Design a protein around this ligand. Structure first.
Ligand SMILES: O=C(O)C(=O)CS(=O)(=O)O
Ligand SMILES: O=C(O)C(=O)CS(=O)(=O)O
Ligand SMILES: O=C(O)C(=O)CS(=O)(=O)O
Ligand SMILES: O=C(O)C(=O)CS(=O)(=O)O
Ligand SMILES: [Mg+2]
Ligand SMILES: [Mg+2]
Ligand SMILES: [Mg+2]
Ligand SMILES: [Mg+2]
Lengths: 291, 291, 289, 289
């Protein structure tokens, strides 16, 4: 069961699926250990851990390198938030090849311009890619694949860009017909209005993916009611990690002692176990001259 | 005030200094924001976030790349736990040049063999570098510097390797004479016995650095009593980050909702602020055609 | 002196300066030893040694690393041909900083869209960037540098695209007023007419850089007479390398032997010297018991 | 067929096979087109194009990326000269996996210590690894591969180091029993005596690979008669490239013109073809409105 196949099956499953954000090898392993069937390589969380902005500042090969360590450290599929493809169809298809090679299950591309701006920002230019063009990019990525099960998810930032339903629906149809394996309908509204609207008008033309970050209060079962195939928990490991580090850093700063953190944080032996140090020990005993 | 100078002054200060571990650009920014005058680029925390082991699995340029993002995102000096230098004096001095160029304040090298094993492990081969040799490596690094204030810290893993005080003291003296800017005396004992022993026998021949991880219960003021120049909080941001992600990942998994994490983790706007998104906005308004 | 200073001095000299193309650490060291005062970090050549197209396929950091090995191997400046900057102003300024830290001396940015298309191509569409946008991108780079001598060369593709003198001048004036340290007027024409027409109208507002690839018969003195501050031999070492590799590979493939190539190629000791292996020997003597 | 399979088939053929050295994407594509069935990823050449020494100065991942561009640009196999493996068995097995994923066909590891020293050097100390340790490292690689055809070539430096036939055989037998797919017996001698002495005692236990650099006058047929399965022309394209770059750079530097080099170097259109620019044109036609 290759990772691509897994991700393909989750997207194609009538049953509602869940992938969780990870932004590095360590968090990739954790998401997997918790039982999640999938991982979301958040464009924002990856750039965030690096300390840069979610606006194509890190190079795409740097994004892929980060993701390489993530693939190596996980057995479950990683869908990478690949922004706009980092350029035209050619940059797009080249990225798809690097992704397959590293074991990454799929890439998600958004109909915006390079470089992009995070979707959660209010009052900022959020210009769209010409529909017909973005579709060819979708198709060029699909055509370029070597692995049939690799997934290409198209993201309609129409609602995000302030446009209406007709626009969103138009784009979705265009990219699904272009071969996309699922359509990601985004919105920043605090309510599920836009999703409710698209889904109603979509008439199950294809698996749909959503990012409930801004309307988190919405009852999950409601997504099943609408018939969404997969939900993406987009950035909570990143956000929790900050709290923990800010709180821990503050506490250690103030007390100039480790006394007040030792019991609130994981042990050194838990780290060693997450790196699979026992496997090296096994191997060391096996490939190193006994004495 | 260059970063090297800062780190030089902290090491040389009679006053006890504190540097905190960071393992990526994001945590580097946080450690700085909390007020810390320095950052510890933990060999283990860096390899841990990548998902590999603290045994030279990631390449040194991958370690340096990680550290590059960290330097860019911080104004305070970063001392990098550089293991054994990733090879002989030549690999050592080449690393020192890359470090200067990226803005990194200094490198800490340990008298062990390549590839190394984390020091916190019990019952594992912890073979030492020939003293005279490691000293030349120290000297070759010092000689190679372009920036006079860059720091080279020598780490005596003698106590760690199970040897005694005479050995530790011998090594320390050898490397200090070789030019090192501070000696890092390590131990895994649950008590400060070894440090108390070295410091007593050292007679302030040079600034000494310590990693209190295993004897964290020891009263900090006691390090000042002994005359230690700097303490290193080696891996607590890494460990806290795991707790947070494991707990958060578990909670989201179980509830299939974001309802129970939203209030326990930092906000999306706090992330944007840690990436300094406002600076880009300023710049965007300034270098992008108004309309 | 400082590489950036070395290069700014060249762009501002009243003398026709020359910078040779290099595409990896090794060729950059050769150029250096040959006497050249500067190196042209050819995007085409750099992409070509990687076996990829001059179409922004290789990430901008991969190009940066290539140039890092190159800067490391030379004491003279390297002007990196950074295509259109690999993005918007933000991507450009991120580039300028890194390039600075890596020891590179300057960046030449061109006014086309990302991803770009090589200039010597015919029939291929060459879209031009908005003038203000590109000009604002030049300012941003100039404002972002931390070494006042690092040079930002603005490159006009108006001719390559198929437009006229009137269009080139307007773009060149705009970029120069934005803070460019020099203007590079390109042309794929058979003669120097485009450069002539421009140099004549330019009135020496700022240093002008050119690439004679397609009009290489123009006698060099003519550029001096036009006032051209710098010339770029942009891809000859790369083209030469290929010629030599194709032939040595053919000869060996056919002879199933090395006797017919060993006397037509530098020696292994020559490679060691180019790698400055002698320095390592002196160093091993100091730092190895 | 699969690159790894292509290469394993070559090491096991009863025929004397040849693999040519390449050091970047471009030369690898040239080697491919010339007809060669395999490419030798020369550590010396790879380090030399970077402008650095064959002394493990460039990280093992930087070498990997270089080879990635190389694998991407060729349909034939590439045997990477991975020096001593860049560390202990663990570092070696990490290497094998990456190399696999990048499409490389095999790795040749040598029994010296990290960081290594080029073999053609004289007087330089050449420390040998413990036999069991190195043999155990070979097993580890063989046990770690996920593509059964990926080949692990073990390289004996006993002669290069200055020891005798008796030492080479023992090391070669040990590594072969550990699972090596082939043994590479090196020698910097003026004649094939070392190879002779070894091939004779070897009794064809396994495929044997050689590098004729220093004894290039030996007629190739003699290797066939000795039973040698593969020969490596290890650095000629790199040495050729330098010769051509040194001369083209000299000529241009002196003429302050291109007329005397433009007729002695491949054309710009030749570079485009080598970059498979034609494929992009076909693609732009499909995927651009
Ligand atoms: O996590 C990301 O980077 C996303 O794709 C979703 S958003 O943050 O852009 O809304
Ligand atoms: O944090 C590290 O990697 C250290 O140098 C200290 S220890 O973890 O090795 O004890
Ligand atoms: O070498 C390059 O990429 C150049 O800048 C010159 S040209 O090939 O575009 O004419
Ligand atoms: O090209 C190399 O690095 C070789 O393996 C052959 S030798 O140069 O070491 O003889
Ligand atoms: Mg995103
Ligand atoms: Mg450490
Ligand atoms: Mg160019
Ligand atoms: Mg070699």
């Amino acid at each position: 069961v290759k990772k691509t196949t897994q991700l393909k099956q989750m997207l194609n499953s009538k049953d509602l699926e869940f992938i969780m954000e990870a932004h590095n090898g360590l968090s990739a392993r954790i998401v997997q250990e918790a039982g999640f069937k999938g991982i979301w390589g958040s464009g924002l969380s990856v750039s965030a851990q690096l300390g840069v902005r979610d606006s194509n500042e890190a190079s795409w090969t740097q994004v892929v390198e980060v993701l390489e360590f993530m693939s190596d450290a996980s057995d479950v599929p990683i869908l990478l938030d690949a922004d706009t493809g980092y350029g035209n169809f050619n940059n797009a298809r080249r990225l798809v090849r690097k992704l397959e090679d590293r074991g990454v299950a799929g890439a998600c591309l958004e109909d915006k311009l390079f470089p992009k701006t995070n979707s959660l920002h209010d009052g900022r230019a959020q210009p769209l890619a010409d529909i017909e063009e973005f579709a060819l990019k979708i198709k060029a990525c699909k055509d370029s694949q070597t692995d049939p099960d690799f997934c290409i998810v198209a993201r309609v930032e129409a609602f995000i860009a302030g446009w209406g339903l007709d626009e969103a629906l138009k784009r979705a149809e265009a990219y699904r017909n272009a071969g996309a394996d699922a359509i990601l309908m985004h919105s920043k509204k605090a309510d599920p209005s836009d999703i409710e609207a698209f889904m109603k008008a979509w008439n199950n033309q294809g698996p749909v993916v959503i990012v409930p970050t801004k309307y988190y209060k919405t009852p999950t079962d409601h997504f099943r009611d609408m018939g969404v195939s997969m939900v993406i928990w987009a950035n909570h490991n990143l956000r929790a990690s900050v709290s923990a580090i800010q709180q821990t850093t503050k506490q250690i700063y103030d007390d100039q002692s480790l006394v007040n953190v030792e019991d609130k944080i994981v042990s050194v032996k838990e780290i060693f176990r997450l790196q699979r140090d026992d496997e090296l020990v096994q191997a060391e005993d096996k490939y190193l001259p006994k004495n």
